[PDB]
A paper describes a structure:
During eukaryotic replication, the helicase function is provided by the Cdc45-MCM-Go-Ichi-Ni-San (GINS) (CMG) assembly comprising Cdc45, GINS, and a hetero-hexameric motor known as the MCM complex (minichromosome maintenance, formed by the Mcm2-3-4-5-6-7 subunits) (Ilves et al., 2010, Moyer et al., 2006). MCM belongs to the superfamily of AAA+ ATPases (ATPases associated with various cellular activities), which contain bipartite-active sites with catalytic residues contributed by neighboring subunits (Neuwald et al., 1999). We imaged ATP-hydrolysis-driven translocation of the CMG using cryo-electron microscopy (cryo-EM) and found that the six MCM subunits engage DNA using four neighboring protomers at a time, with ATP binding promoting DNA engagement. To identify any additional states within the two major 3D classes, we performed further classification focused on the ATPase domains. This analysis led us to identify four different DNA engagement modes of the CMG, with global resolutions ranging from 3.7 to 4.5 Å.
In three of our four structures (states 1A, 2A, and 2B), single-stranded DNA is engaged by four ATPase subunits via a set of pore loops arranged in a right-handed spiral. In three of these states, ATPase pore loops from a set of four neighboring protomers form a right-handed staircase spiraling around single-stranded DNA. These protomers are Mcm6/2/5/3 (state 1A), Mcm2/6/4/7 (state 2A) and Mcm6/4/7/3 (state 2B), respectively. In states 2A and 2B, two neighboring AAA+ modules (which we refer to as seam subunits I and II) appear detached from the staircase. In three of our four structures, ATP-bound protomers are all tightly interacting and staircase engaged, and flanked by two (state 2B) or three (states 1A and 1B) ADP-bound protomers. Conversely, no direct DNA interaction can be detected for ADP-bound seam subunits in states 1A, 1B, and 2B. We note that the DNA in states 2B and 2A has a register shift of one subunit, resulting in vertical DNA repositioning. Transition from states 2B to 2A involves release of 3′ DNA by Mcm3 PS1h and ATP binding by Mcm2, which binds to the N-terminal end of the AAA+ staircase. Conversely, in state 2B, duplex DNA can only be seen to interact with stabilizing helicase elements such as the B domain of Mcm5, whereas in state 2A, the incoming duplex DNA is not well resolved. Two-dimensional averages of side views confirm that states 2A and 2B indeed show dynamic duplex-DNA engagement, explaining the weak density protruding from N-terminal MCM in the averaged cryo-EM volume.
Residue numbers in the entry:
A (entry chain 3): 4 to 100, 106 to 206, 210 to 246, 252 to 268, 271 to 302, 304 to 305, 308 to 338, 340 to 343, ...
B (entry chain 7): 3 to 66, 69 to 87, 93 to 110, 126 to 138, 146 to 306, 321 to 646
C (entry chain 5): 246 to 271, 281 to 308, 312 to 394, 396 to 405, 408 to 409, 412, 418 to 489
DNA sequence: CGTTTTATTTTTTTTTTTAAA
């Protein structure tokens, strides 16, 4: 209770509580019946400054003390309306919503609630800390109490010390627990987004219970905070910024039950195969129809009180030089799905015996690179050259899709549902059947059903396709350009194609993803007849008429692939059903 | 706020009026039975559960802190003696101190104890007694823990009481004694272990289930401190569920490394639950083959492999002649690449076979599956920390594609071929480790899929030393069969349109029922009547002639005869009749013959 | 106070400070404190290089020469402004330094505005000193192989980065492709055909790219 | 009847281990 404005300042927030914004929009039946109980309200400064601009400054020069105050007005409001959300008498912190580079926090903004954007990194240990002391006097049996404080909450501390006893007389004095509450505390640091850099300079932050690690090191965010520094330089100094809210920018959705209604109605257009196949890479003949499932992951299967079967698909094919400018249109758009360097390790799934980092370390750098794509997908180049050590470490996966190594590190098991692609180079060029399909590459055929196809990619320059190559590839090269800035919109041959610039689009495409990746289209009465009859005739009649030439991987473990192809098709139309013509999409690979 | 006293009245009513007639059989006194079991000087720990007080009232379903209630009830019934001299060490030793003449905890003599994971463990859980399941890690051992010593003054004579709750302490000095008070007659202070009270003390780390941890998460562990009776109540790598308390840890000491209000929490224990009775129902069923019918329904046909496994499930052949033991464990080998779902049966066995394991073709090099060594200049020295193959005793560690791991890798595993012997001149020993693990070998053929021109060890590249250690070697190939894959297909798709495969051909056997029926088997040690000894030695020769009549054929070890002996008496464990007879070995030879004579025709 | 954010490495300074201290004494007897502070530095303006950090008559210089349509083949004797080589074929540089155009599309791809060119041959042709000059004639670094190329203070792991440092607008020209370790020859395949960059030492992924390119020099076979 | 408490980091040589055309 400093200079006595404090209550008047409280009143001015309480004076937030009168008419249509408060009386209609704001709280009460805006959080409490939606039932989250999380103290934190969103503040929007432009309103408070529209009411009490002096109080919009009351923070921006001294935000040391707006906080007990804000909480007080809130408990008054919520405490004088709802008796349910009132038995949590604590501070019950709030929103408080200048973006400067972590490099431009320059002695100042002290006392100010201001913004910086940057990298989540060094996401760190979690440990609670203590608020009050529910102490007891077991002879006299009075539950008395001792509150505590830190600079990280307010300015002062109590005689911050051991939980007391033998304080009054030497009577029965002991703690009582389950009531002396605690507060979840987290610590981490932030860096500037590196592209701006010409050593880029970091910052340090501290958190609390409802603010606790909303994302991960390897993500980035906008974050708003005050400033302090406690130590006494020369009776050095070092600071930290705090008093925070959260936001995040690198995600993806004004999608209530309207957008689902949008996505349903256009369902019935039957050959979406056309549309969705010509969607991402019109910059490329050729596949895209076939790409479908490497995006979709796969399908889940569990036996009662037993085991399961892995669901997702893995294929790659080709003449040298479309294969490095191709593995795209999903590497960027697909959620959190990561291809890798091409010839990479120390991170496929190994420890890499190198104990020159922290002088100890058992698991101190034990990890791989496909579990970052858990429920995603992968591609790479240079498989045609890559090592055979962790080829071993593939055969576990494509068979199982769970990683189970224990070279003394630890006896692992860890979920993964992932798919991944490969490279190629023909060690002798233009030979596919004159010589043979196989081993114009320098490759192996043990991986029969490991990947889910034997497929081919070909070319020859020609005389007859000569001007065809010219005129189409250049049709591209000048339908590349506008009116067909530095480049306006290229219309014609997407307007002679009677199209529209919000039907060939990403958020328009993944309009039909998030929900389509959620269904459970069970089987009916047709696979059962189809699959065994046909694979029975196939594995024998793939052995005649020159098609023994290209019959390298014939297995009956393929019979899962034969299903999880169409499983995507059942969610390509969101029908919890399947047809014989849905079959033909998962045979026409042939 | 609430009274911690009138509840004492409530619980007096609870335990006093405790013969709760909900069923035929409760008018007797239940906790009176446990009371007199205290009067038996037997029970030192009683137990509380939700149902017990739940019927009583509904307060204390959310009042019970879990702390004050315990000391209160303990003192409450400590002063309850409604009820013999020399029963205990200390108990009579007080009488020794009274022969010439306390808190009730110093005469402790008894105790009591009473759908979320560490990840979900929200940080407003202090004091609440909650439930979590994990996996044990880093097995350790148990030592005594003081509670309150007896620091006698000698010259004065006043056995001082230092009842303590902390984990660190400070001595008690010369005398807080009445005659050692201002009255100048005094000696010094000094404890007496005999009259002192201490308590067992087991601790180990707890790691996560690994089935919950999201896409972007890394499992972490907590600490376990279980003291007193419940010590020695879990091994490493048991998937166990614990009900206890979250409690912070007043790590007092330095005044700047602490003094943050550090709160490095820990857990307090009650119990280690880890997720004949059957005899009447075992009387309901008398059959040998139905196990294959309800074990691993997921594939139709190829029963022969399964029954070969179920034999290893069976066991029951061992002897210790000449002072030396004999290997009573079966070790199958497996070649093939069809779609078999070796991964299937491996997962099935590893689930149902209690005390199971799994390794892969390169996940464990030779030091990991066995014991190994480490390096760190921060914790002390290093140990062996044995691996899956080390740990899998009384069970099986199942390697997949042992063909492809490495050639020299065959060595240390070959060492365990002679069971229970893991020699290590690495940590200054010739240590043993008791490698008592049944072994499961499964691999794929070499380049190709059993190319008929490239013959055995022409197509294979494996030294004889390991095949000799393996009872059975099995190649699995099923060429194009027009009718074969059909049934298997519709069979597979059944649990795709459905969830449970086999209808109306057998009564399915759950993991529990399967294991229990198997639990009744191995202790027969059956009879092999004497006519077999002359007979079987003859039949063995029948092999050794048709082995030699072709010269490009398999070599033979004494284990061929030792094996064909070893298998038969085992299966009588599941015949449960102590009657090793003709069929006991005719199936042995039958299955041996089926192991062979399958690749040419 | 205000004299930070003023100075970065690779510069040349004059200064005034103080010879002052930080330690105390009477260290087998008393060894102690060097440092200085600032008062009022005065830095240098070294000649003609530093259009780097801190006219229209020159545009008249620029344009009245391009008014002449005689630049394509005229500056085919300029890029080596004082010595012989590439003479009738130096016209092919006219495309590369200006480059083509990183013509993005509505669809996925960001095309290869970056495009690469080659040289290869024996020594003695002034091939060492020619590209030596090319660093003098936009921005780059120049040597070949293992010589760019895959602290004890305040407990923060610094990482100064990769090869887009001086080349993202800058481009390079270097010898010894195969005359180099094959561990640092994956990156070239990621760098170059696409700038398919990534990071995996620690657990975070630099998604870098560049408008950069290379030339190759050679002393390979025959 | 008064006046004071408490922190360490990087490199060696052995015995372990691990890498490429
Ligand atoms: N049908 C096509 N559609 C799109 N682009 C094509 C097509 N045919 C050729 N191209 C172009 O030709 C170029 C071929 O070189 P590319 O970058 O594909 O080499 P690469 O296939 O990655 O070489 P390698 O596979 O040996 O590493 C591609 O950049 C691609 O843009
Ligand atoms: N008759 C069958 N019974 C049960 N499952 C089958 C049958 N036929 C095929 N399957 C399924 O097909 C899948 C084939 O892949 P699988 O896991 O068998 O590889 P694998 O045969 O173990 O490989 P490898 O033998 O090379 O190690 C199996 O998971 C299995 O569930
Ligand atoms: N046509 C030429 N004009 C000028 N100098 C030349 C010419 N041909 C060779 N030289 C000489 O060659 C030297 C560079 O040789 P260099 O390219 O280093 O050989 P290498 O490539 O084997 O190292 C220069 O010092 C230069 O004097």
């Amino acid at each position: 209770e400093g200079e006595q404005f404090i209550k008047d300042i409280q009143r001015e927030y309480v004076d937030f509580l009168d008419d249509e914004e408060d009386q209609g929009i704001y709280a009460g039946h805006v959080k409490d019946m939606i039932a989250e109980k999380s103290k934190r309200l969103i503040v929007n400064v432009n309103d408070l400054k529209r009411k009490n601009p002096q109080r919009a400054l009351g923070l921006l020069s001294n935000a040391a003390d707006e906080q007990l105050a804000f909480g007080r007005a809130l408990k008054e409001y919520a405490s004088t309306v709802d008796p349910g959300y009132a038995k949590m008498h604590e501070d019950l912190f709030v929103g408080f919503e200048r973006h400067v580079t972590p490099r431009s926090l320059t002695s100042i903004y002290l006392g100010n609630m201001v913004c910086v954007e940057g990298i989540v990194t060094k996401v760190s240990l979690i440990r609670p800390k203590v608020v009050r002391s529910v102490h007891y006097c077991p002879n006299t049996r009075k539950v008395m109490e001792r509150k505590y404080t830190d600079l990280t909450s307010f300015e002062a501390v109590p005689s911050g010390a051991a939980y007391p006893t033998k304080d009054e007389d030497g009577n029965l004095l002991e703690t009582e627990y389950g009531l002396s509450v605690y507060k979840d505390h987290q610590t981490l640091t932030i860096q500037e987004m590196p592209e701006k850099a010409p050593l880029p300079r970091s910052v340090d932050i501290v958190c609390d219970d409802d603010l606790v690690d909303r994302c991960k090191p390897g993500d980035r965010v906008q974050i708003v905070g005050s400033y302090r520094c406690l130590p006494g330089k020369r009776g050095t100094f070092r600071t930290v910024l705090l008093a925070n809210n959260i936001s995040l920018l690198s995600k993806e959705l004004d999608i209530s039950r309207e957008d689902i209604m949008l996505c349903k109605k256009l369902a019935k257009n039957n050959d979406i195969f056309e549309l969705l196949s010509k969607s991402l890479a019109p910059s490329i003949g050729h596949v895209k129809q076939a790409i479908l499932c490497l995006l979709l992951g796969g399908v889940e299967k569990i036996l009662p009180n037993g085991t399961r079967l892995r669901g997702d698909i893995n294929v790659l094919l080709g003449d040298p030089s479309a294969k490095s400018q191709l593995l795209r249109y999903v590497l960027n758009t697909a959620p959190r799905a990561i291809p890798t360097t091409g010839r990479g390790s120390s991170g496929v799934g190994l420890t890499a015996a190198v104990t020159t980092d922290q002088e100890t370390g058992e698991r101190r750098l034990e990890a791989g690179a496909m579990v970052l794509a858990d429920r995603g997908v992968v591609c790479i180049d240079e498989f045609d050259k890559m090592s055979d050590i962790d080829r071993t470490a593939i055969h576990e996966v494509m068979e199982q899709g769970r990683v189970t190594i224990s070279k003394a590190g630890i006896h692992a098991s860890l979920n993964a549902r992932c798919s991944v692609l490969a490279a190629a180079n023909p060690v002798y060029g233009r030979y596919d059947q004159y010589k043979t399909p196989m081993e114009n590459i320098g490759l192996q055929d043990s991986l029969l059903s490991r990947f889910d196809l034997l497929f081919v990619m070909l070319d020859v320059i020609d005389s007859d396709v000569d001007q065809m190559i010219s005129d189409h590839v250049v049709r591209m090269h000048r339908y590349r350009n506008p009116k067909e800035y530095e480049k306006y919109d290229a219309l014609l041959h997407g307007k002679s194609r009677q199209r529209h610039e919000k039907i060939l689009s990403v958020e328009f495409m993944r309009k039909y993803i998030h929900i389509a990746k959620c269904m459970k289209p069970k089987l009916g009465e047709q696979a059962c007849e189809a699959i065994a009859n046909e694979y029975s005739r196939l594995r024998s009649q793939e052995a005649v008429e020159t098609d023994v030439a290209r019959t390298q991987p014939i297995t009956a473990r393929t019979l899962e692939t034969l299903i999880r192809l169409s499983t995507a098709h059942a969610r390509a139309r969101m029908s919890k059903s399947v047809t014989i013509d849905d079959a033909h999409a998962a045979i026409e690979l042939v | 706020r609430r009274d911690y006293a009138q509840d004492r009245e409530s619980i007096k009513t609870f335990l006093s009026e405790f013969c709760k007639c909900d069923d035929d059989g409760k008018k007797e006194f239940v906790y009176g039975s446990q009371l007199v079991k205290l009067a038996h000087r037997e029970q030192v720990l009683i137990t509380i559960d939700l149902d017990d007080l739940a019927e009583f009232n509904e307060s204390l379903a959310e009042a019970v802190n879990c702390r004050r209630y315990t000391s209160i009830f303990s003192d409450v019934i400590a002063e309850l003696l409604p009820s013999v001299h020399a029963k205990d060490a200390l108990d009579v030793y007080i009488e020794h101190r009274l022969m010439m003449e306390f808190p009730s905890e110093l005469m402790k003599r008894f105790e009591v104890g009473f759908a979320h994971s560490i990840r979900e463990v929200k940080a407003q859980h202090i004091g609440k007694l909650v439930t979590v399941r994990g996996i044990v890690t880093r097995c350790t051992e148990v030592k005594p823990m003081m509670v309150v010593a007896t620091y006698t003054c000698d010259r004065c004579g006043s056995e001082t009481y230092q009842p303590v709750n902390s984990l660190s302490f400070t001595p008690v000095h010369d005398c807080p004694s009445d005659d050692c008070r201002v009255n100048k007659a005094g000696g010094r202070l000094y404890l007496q272990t005999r009259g002192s009270k201490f308590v067992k003390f087991q601790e180990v780390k707890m790691q996560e289930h690994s089935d919950q941890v999201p896409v972007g998460h890394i499992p972490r562990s907590m600490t376990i401190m279980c003291r007193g009776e419940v010590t020695r109540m879990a091994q490493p790598g048991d998937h166990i569920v614990v009900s206890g308390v979250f409690l912070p840890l007043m790590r007092t000491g330095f005044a700047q490394m602490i003094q943050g209000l550090l709160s490095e929490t820990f857990l307090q224990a009650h119990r280690i639950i880890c997720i004949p009775e059957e005899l009447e129902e075992l009387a309901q069923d008398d059959f040998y083959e139905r196990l294959a019918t309800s074990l691993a329904p997921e594939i139709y046909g190829h029963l022969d492999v399964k029954k070969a496994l179920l034999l290893l499930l069976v066991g029951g052949v061992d002897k210790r002649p000449d002072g030396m033991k004999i290997r009573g464990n079966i070790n199958i080998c497996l070649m093939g690449d069809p779609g078999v779902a070796k991964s299937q049966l491996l997962g099935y066995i590893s689930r149902l076979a209690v005390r199971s394991q799994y390794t892969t073709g390169r996940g464990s090099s030779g030091v990991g599956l066995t014991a190994a060594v480490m390096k760190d200049p921060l914790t002390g020295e290093m140990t062996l920390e044995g691996g899956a193959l080390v740990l899998a005793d009384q069970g099986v560690c199942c390697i997949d594609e042992f063909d492809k791991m490495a050639d020299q890798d065959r060595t240390a595993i070959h060492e365990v071929m002679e069971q229970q012997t893991i020699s290590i001149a690495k940590a200054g020993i010739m240590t043993t480790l008791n490698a008592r693990v049944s072994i499961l070998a499964a691999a794929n053929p070499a380049f190709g899929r059993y190319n008929p021109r490239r013959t055995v060890e022409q197509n294979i590249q494996l030294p004889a030393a390991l095949l000799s250690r393996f009872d059975l070697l099995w190649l699995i190939q099923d060429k194009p069969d027009r009718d074969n894959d059909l049934r298997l297909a519709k069979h597979i798709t059944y649990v795709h349109s459905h969830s449970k495969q086999p209808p109306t051909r057998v009564k399915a056997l759950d993991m529990n029922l399967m294991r229990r029926y198997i639990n009744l088997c191995k202790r027969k040690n059956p009879t092999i009547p004497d006519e077999l000894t002359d007979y079987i030695v003859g039949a063995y020769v029948e092999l050794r002639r048709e082995a030699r009549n072709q010269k490009d054929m398999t070599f033979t070890s004494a284990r061929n005869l030792l094996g064909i002996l070893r298998l038969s008496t085992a299966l009588a464990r599941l015949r449960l009749s102590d009657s090793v007879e003709k069929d006991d070995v005719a199936e042995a030879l039958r299955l041996l013959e089926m192991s062979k004579d399958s690749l040419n025709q | 106070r205000s004299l930070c954010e003023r100075v970065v490495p690779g510069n040349r300074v004059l200064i005034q400070g103080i010879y002052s201290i930080r330690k105390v004494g009477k260290a087998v007897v008393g060894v102690r404190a060097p440092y200085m502070r600032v008062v009022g530095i005065t830095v240098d303006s070294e000649g003609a290089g530093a259009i780097s950090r801190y006219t229209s008559d020159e545009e008249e210089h620029f344009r009245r020469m391009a008014a002449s349509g005689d630049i394509y083949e005229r500056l085919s004797q300029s890029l080596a402004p004082s010595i012989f080589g590439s003479r009738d074929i130096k016209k092919a540089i006219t495309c590369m330094l200006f480059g083509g155009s990183r013509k993005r599309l509505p669809d996925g791809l960001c095309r290869r505005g970056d495009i690469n060119v080659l040289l290869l041959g024996d020594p003695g042709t002034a091939k060492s000193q020619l590209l030596k000059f090319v660093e003098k004639v936009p921005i780059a670094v120049y040597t070949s192989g293992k010589g760019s190329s895959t602290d004890p203070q305040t407990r923060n792991f610094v990482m100064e980065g990769g090869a887009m440092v001086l080349a993202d607008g800058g481009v390079v020209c270097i010898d010894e492709f195969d005359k180099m370790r094959e561990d640092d020859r994956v990156a070239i395949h990621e760098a170059m055909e696409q700038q398919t960059i990534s990071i995996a030492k620690a657990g975070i992924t630099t998604t870098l790219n560049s408008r950069c390119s290379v030339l190759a020099a050679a002393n390979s076979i025959f």
